[PDB]
Write a protein that binds this ligand. Structure first.
Ligand SMILES: [Zn+2]
Ligand SMILES: [Zn+2]
Length: 216
């Protein structure tokens, strides 16, 4: 029910927030980013819906910021809902190969661009994608903005609770979170999907939450 929001987080970096009713969670927020590169926009995750995806695209396009592409952090609809809409307007969509395979098994439209392997530059020296290992889902990836020191951790970053465990790898998550912590300890900001922007400390809190969750 709450409207899409778009707020400036840093130079060239915006957080978009969209909202869905999920059984047994109530209203769930979903943060993505929009990164400006040379005055063009990259979507980091789509909103849940084609409607919120249209609104996000229009906000940037009306202000003279052409959409250059989207990258989806994992296969769940809170990352991928707007792929179909983006494809219908010939905006390049990006996902890992495993994210595309899971999208296809789940009867969902796929990104027109895939990458495999651990590191992938969406835009070299500006938008990097890292796979830390399975956690929230087998396919979850994070997006690093080296220039700003900003990690989009997506649905992997779970600083107060692990959320929906439906597709989770509870065995692997702590090791993944271990690896993520070592690599991005130098993060100025960490943006999770389902709770508010924080600092590097969100890496620790997620490790602790993973260790804790595995213990049961
Ligand atoms: Zn998810
Ligand atoms: Zn999520």
């Amino acid at each position: 029910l709450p409207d899409l929001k778009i707020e400036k987080l840093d130079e060239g970096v915006y957080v978009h927030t969209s909202f869905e009713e999920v059984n047994g969670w109530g209203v769930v927020p979903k943060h993505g980013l929009v990164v400006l590169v040379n005055a063009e926009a990259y979507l980091i995750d789509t909103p849940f819906t084609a409607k919120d995806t249209e609104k996000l695209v229009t906000w940037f396009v009306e202000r003279g910021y052409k959409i250059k592409g989207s990258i989806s952090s994992h296969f769940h609809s809170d990352s991928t809902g707007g792929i179909e809409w983006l494809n219908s307007r010939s905006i390049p969509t990006y996902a890992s190969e495993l994210t595309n395979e899971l999208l296809k098994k789940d009867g969902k439209v796929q990104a027109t661009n895939s990458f495999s392997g651990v590191n992938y530059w969406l835009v070299k020296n500006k938008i990097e994608v890292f796979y830390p290992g399975p956690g929230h889902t087998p396919d979850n990836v994070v997006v690093w903005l080296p220039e700003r020191k900003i990690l989009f951790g997506g649905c992997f970053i779970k600083p107060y609770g692990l959320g929906n465990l439906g597709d989770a790898n509870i065995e692997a998550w702590p090791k993944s979170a271990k690896l993520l912590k070592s690599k991005y300890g130098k993060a100025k900001l960490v943006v999770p999907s389902h709770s508010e922007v924080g600092d590097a400390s969100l890496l620790k809190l997620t490790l602790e939450q993973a260790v804790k969750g595995l213990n049961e």
